[PDB]
Protein backbone atom coordinates (compact mmCIF):
# COMPACT_ATOMS: atom_id res chain seq x y z
CA UNK A 1 0.00 0.00 0.00
CA UNK A 2 2.51 2.34 1.24
CA UNK A 3 6.00 3.01 -0.35
CA UNK A 4 7.73 2.52 3.35
CA UNK A 5 5.25 -0.67 3.44
CA UNK A 6 6.96 -1.81 0.25
CA UNK A 7 10.24 -1.37 0.97
CA UNK A 8 10.00 -3.14 4.50
CA UNK A 9 8.26 -6.33 2.69
CA UNK A 10 11.11 -5.92 -0.44
CA UNK A 11 13.79 -6.07 2.86
CA UNK A 12 12.01 -9.57 4.04
CA UNK A 13 12.02 -11.38 0.76
CA UNK A 14 15.99 -9.96 0.38
CA UNK A 15 16.73 -11.47 3.64
CA UNK A 16 14.67 -14.55 3.28
CA UNK A 17 15.79 -15.46 -0.50
CA UNK A 18 18.70 -13.11 -1.46
CA UNK A 19 19.60 -12.18 -5.13
CA UNK A 20 16.85 -14.36 -5.93
CA UNK A 21 14.46 -11.83 -3.87
CA UNK A 22 14.46 -9.48 -6.96
CA UNK A 23 12.55 -11.54 -9.50
CA UNK A 24 9.72 -12.07 -7.13
CA UNK A 25 9.42 -8.77 -6.26
CA UNK A 26 9.39 -7.39 -10.05
CA UNK A 27 6.86 -10.12 -10.59
CA UNK A 28 4.53 -9.20 -7.74
CA UNK A 29 5.01 -5.61 -8.79
CA UNK A 30 6.57 -4.56 -5.33
CA UNK A 31 8.68 -1.99 -7.20
CA UNK A 32 9.27 0.93 -4.91
CA UNK A 33 12.36 2.11 -7.20
CA UNK A 34 10.57 2.58 -10.37
CA UNK A 35 10.26 5.94 -11.73
CA UNK A 36 9.25 5.57 -15.24
CA UNK A 37 11.83 7.99 -15.93
CA UNK A 38 15.58 8.27 -16.24
CA UNK A 39 16.85 10.67 -13.74
CA UNK A 40 16.79 14.75 -14.62
CA UNK A 41 20.92 15.20 -13.87
CA UNK A 42 21.84 12.05 -16.80
CA UNK A 43 20.27 14.02 -19.64
CA UNK A 44 21.80 17.32 -17.69
CA UNK A 45 25.03 15.98 -18.01
CA UNK A 46 24.66 14.85 -21.41
CA UNK A 47 23.40 17.76 -23.11
CA UNK A 48 26.23 20.01 -21.20
CA UNK A 49 29.60 20.82 -22.11
CA UNK A 50 30.99 18.13 -19.99
CA UNK A 51 28.66 15.49 -21.40
CA UNK A 52 29.10 16.36 -25.14
CA UNK A 53 32.78 15.71 -24.44
CA UNK A 54 31.64 12.49 -23.92
CA UNK A 55 29.48 11.59 -26.92
CA UNK A 56 31.58 13.41 -29.50
CA UNK A 57 34.39 11.43 -28.74
CA UNK A 58 32.78 8.01 -29.25
CA UNK A 59 33.23 5.61 -32.39
CA UNK A 60 30.50 3.89 -34.01
CA UNK A 61 31.39 1.02 -31.86
CA UNK A 62 30.75 3.32 -28.43
CA UNK A 63 29.40 0.26 -25.78
CA UNK A 64 26.61 1.56 -23.08
CA UNK A 65 26.53 -0.61 -20.10
CA UNK A 66 23.01 0.07 -17.97
CA UNK A 67 23.70 -2.60 -14.92
CA UNK A 68 20.23 -3.05 -12.83
CA UNK A 69 18.78 -2.00 -15.42
CA UNK A 70 15.02 -2.17 -13.94
CA UNK A 71 12.33 -1.20 -17.27
CA UNK A 72 15.46 0.33 -18.49
CA UNK A 73 14.87 3.73 -19.28
CA UNK A 74 18.35 4.43 -18.70
CA UNK A 75 19.28 1.85 -21.10
CA UNK A 76 16.74 3.15 -24.04
CA UNK A 77 18.31 7.18 -22.93
CA UNK A 78 22.03 6.22 -24.21
CA UNK A 79 20.20 4.31 -27.58
CA UNK A 80 18.71 6.96 -28.89
CA UNK A 81 22.08 8.83 -28.47
CA UNK A 82 23.25 6.56 -30.74
CA UNK A 83 24.69 4.58 -28.39
CA UNK A 84 24.79 0.48 -29.17
CA UNK A 85 23.33 0.13 -25.45
CA UNK A 86 23.22 -3.16 -23.28
CA UNK A 87 20.49 -3.05 -20.18
CA UNK A 88 20.79 -6.11 -18.05
CA UNK A 89 18.87 -6.95 -14.85
CA UNK A 90 18.74 -10.16 -13.09
CA UNK A 91 15.33 -10.61 -13.21
CA UNK A 92 13.79 -11.64 -16.59
CA UNK A 93 10.25 -10.19 -15.40
CA UNK A 94 12.22 -6.70 -15.39
CA UNK A 95 13.64 -7.58 -18.47
CA UNK A 96 10.03 -8.06 -20.28
CA UNK A 97 8.48 -5.31 -18.53
CA UNK A 98 11.13 -3.46 -20.55
CA UNK A 99 10.67 -4.92 -23.76
CA UNK A 100 7.20 -4.30 -23.35
CA UNK A 101 7.60 -0.23 -21.99
CA UNK A 102 10.11 -0.18 -25.12
CA UNK A 103 8.26 -1.64 -27.97
CA UNK A 104 8.25 1.15 -29.91
CA UNK A 105 11.05 2.66 -29.45
CA UNK A 106 13.65 2.64 -32.93
CA UNK A 107 16.57 1.40 -31.12
CA UNK A 108 15.06 -2.14 -29.89
CA UNK A 109 13.65 -2.32 -33.50
CA UNK A 110 17.32 -1.71 -35.12
CA UNK A 111 18.88 -3.94 -31.92
CA UNK A 112 20.78 -0.78 -30.98
CA UNK A 113 19.18 -0.78 -27.82
CA UNK A 114 18.73 -3.93 -26.59
CA UNK A 115 17.90 -6.14 -23.05
CA UNK A 116 19.09 -8.86 -21.80
CA UNK A 117 18.77 -11.30 -18.30
CA UNK A 118 22.04 -11.22 -16.76
CA UNK A 119 23.71 -11.46 -13.57
CA UNK A 120 26.35 -8.51 -13.67
CA UNK A 121 28.59 -10.40 -11.38
CA UNK A 122 28.49 -13.91 -13.45
CA UNK A 123 28.03 -12.65 -17.24
CA UNK A 124 31.17 -12.79 -19.94
CA UNK A 125 32.14 -9.29 -19.93
CA UNK A 126 32.43 -8.98 -24.16
CA UNK A 127 36.06 -8.89 -25.72
CA UNK A 128 36.28 -5.03 -26.48
CA UNK A 129 34.36 -4.11 -23.20
CA UNK A 130 32.50 -1.23 -22.26
CA UNK A 131 33.14 2.36 -23.22
CA UNK A 132 30.34 3.85 -20.53
CA UNK A 133 28.32 2.11 -17.99
CA UNK A 134 26.00 4.05 -15.95
CA UNK A 135 25.13 3.13 -12.23
CA UNK A 136 21.76 4.26 -11.03
CA UNK A 137 20.15 3.06 -8.05
CA UNK A 138 22.20 -0.20 -8.61
CA UNK A 139 25.68 0.09 -5.73
CA UNK A 140 22.89 1.36 -3.99
CA UNK A 141 20.67 -1.69 -4.13
CA UNK A 142 23.34 -4.13 -3.02
CA UNK A 143 24.68 -5.53 0.24
CA UNK A 144 27.62 -3.88 1.55
CA UNK A 145 29.72 -7.32 1.28
CA UNK A 146 28.81 -7.47 -2.04
CA UNK A 147 30.14 -3.07 -3.16
CA UNK A 148 33.86 -4.58 -3.57
CA UNK A 149 32.91 -7.31 -6.15
CA UNK A 150 30.70 -4.39 -7.56
CA UNK A 151 33.79 -2.31 -8.10
CA UNK A 152 36.01 -5.27 -8.97
CA UNK A 153 33.38 -5.88 -11.77
CA UNK A 154 33.51 -2.25 -12.43
CA UNK A 155 37.08 -2.54 -13.26
CA UNK A 156 36.82 -5.26 -15.67
CA UNK A 157 33.54 -3.91 -17.76
CA UNK A 158 34.90 -0.54 -18.67
CA UNK A 159 38.11 -0.27 -21.12
CA UNK A 160 40.32 1.91 -20.37
CA UNK A 161 40.09 5.39 -21.30
CA UNK A 162 36.05 4.91 -20.66
CA UNK A 163 33.55 6.28 -18.68
CA UNK A 164 31.66 5.24 -15.53
CA UNK A 165 28.72 7.24 -14.62
CA UNK A 166 27.36 7.22 -11.27
CA UNK A 167 24.16 8.70 -10.42
CA UNK A 168 25.22 8.38 -6.30
CA UNK A 169 21.55 8.16 -4.61
CA UNK A 170 20.45 7.84 -2.16
CA UNK A 171 22.67 9.79 0.24
CA UNK A 172 21.06 9.44 3.37
CA UNK A 173 23.64 9.30 5.79
CA UNK A 174 23.73 7.07 8.62
CA UNK A 175 20.47 5.13 7.89
CA UNK A 176 21.45 1.85 8.67
CA UNK A 177 19.15 -0.08 6.13
CA UNK A 178 18.70 -1.54 2.82
CA UNK A 179 17.80 -1.90 -0.40
CA UNK A 180 17.99 0.93 -0.81
CA UNK A 181 21.17 1.69 0.87
CA UNK A 182 22.60 5.17 2.33
CA UNK A 183 25.78 5.41 0.69
CA UNK A 184 28.45 8.16 -0.37
CA UNK A 185 31.26 9.11 -2.91
CA UNK A 186 33.22 7.69 -0.45
CA UNK A 187 31.64 4.68 -0.71
CA UNK A 188 31.55 4.47 -4.54
CA UNK A 189 35.09 5.10 -4.21
CA UNK A 190 36.85 2.78 -1.95
CA UNK A 191 34.80 -0.09 -3.86
CA UNK A 192 35.99 1.42 -7.21
CA UNK A 193 39.73 1.18 -5.70
CA UNK A 194 39.89 -1.83 -3.58
CA UNK A 195 45.29 7.08 -3.48
CA UNK A 196 43.40 5.19 -6.12
CA UNK A 197 45.48 3.46 -9.23
CA UNK A 198 42.49 2.27 -11.20
CA UNK A 199 40.42 5.24 -12.07
CA UNK A 200 40.05 9.22 -12.00
CA UNK A 201 37.26 10.79 -10.42
CA UNK A 202 37.29 13.58 -13.42
CA UNK A 203 33.96 15.23 -12.06
CA UNK A 204 31.80 15.11 -8.85
CA UNK A 205 28.88 17.48 -8.89
CA UNK A 206 25.58 18.29 -7.15
CA UNK A 207 23.20 18.39 -10.29
CA UNK A 208 21.41 21.30 -10.58
CA UNK A 209 18.36 19.59 -11.54
CA UNK A 210 17.65 16.58 -9.43
CA UNK A 211 14.09 15.64 -9.21
CA UNK A 212 12.37 16.92 -5.83
CA UNK A 213 12.66 14.21 -3.65
CA UNK A 214 16.53 13.35 -4.72
CA UNK A 215 17.34 16.93 -3.55
CA UNK A 216 20.45 16.60 -1.39
CA UNK A 217 20.54 12.80 -1.30
CA UNK A 218 22.23 13.09 -4.29
CA UNK A 219 25.16 13.67 -6.62
CA UNK A 220 26.24 12.87 -10.08
CA UNK A 221 30.07 11.53 -10.21
CA UNK A 222 32.13 10.85 -13.40
CA UNK A 223 34.79 8.37 -13.23
CA UNK A 224 37.72 7.64 -16.33
CA UNK A 225 39.29 3.89 -15.97
CA UNK A 226 42.99 4.58 -16.50
CA UNK A 227 45.61 2.10 -16.92
N1 LIG B 1 23.61 -9.17 -9.87
C1 LIG B 1 22.52 -8.32 -10.42
N2 LIG B 1 22.72 -8.22 -11.76
C2 LIG B 1 21.87 -7.47 -12.52
N3 LIG B 1 20.82 -6.83 -11.95
C3 LIG B 1 20.63 -6.94 -10.60
C4 LIG B 1 21.47 -7.67 -9.84
N4 LIG B 1 21.06 -7.62 -8.56
C5 LIG B 1 19.95 -6.85 -8.52
N5 LIG B 1 19.70 -6.43 -9.78
C6 LIG B 1 18.61 -5.58 -10.26
O1 LIG B 1 18.91 -4.04 -9.93
C7 LIG B 1 17.73 -3.46 -9.75
C8 LIG B 1 17.69 -2.77 -8.39
S1 LIG B 1 16.39 -1.46 -8.56
C9 LIG B 1 16.18 -1.07 -10.33
C10 LIG B 1 17.16 0.13 -10.62
C11 LIG B 1 17.10 0.73 -12.03
N6 LIG B 1 18.44 1.09 -12.43
C12 LIG B 1 16.13 1.95 -12.07
O2 LIG B 1 16.61 3.15 -12.06
O3 LIG B 1 14.87 1.73 -12.07
C13 LIG B 1 16.65 -4.59 -9.84
O4 LIG B 1 16.04 -4.59 -11.09
C14 LIG B 1 17.45 -5.89 -9.68
O5 LIG B 1 16.73 -6.98 -10.45
Known sequence: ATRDEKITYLRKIIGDKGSDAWDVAWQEGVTPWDQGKIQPPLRDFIESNDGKALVNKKSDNARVLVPGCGKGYDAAYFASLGYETLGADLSSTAIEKAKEFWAESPELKSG????????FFKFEVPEAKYDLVYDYTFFCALPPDLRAPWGARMRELVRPGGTLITLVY???GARSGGPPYSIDVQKV????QGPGKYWTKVLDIVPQTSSPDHVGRE???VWERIN
Open 219 to 221: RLV
Open 170 to 172: PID
Open 189 to 192: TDAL
Open 112 to 119: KLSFQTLD
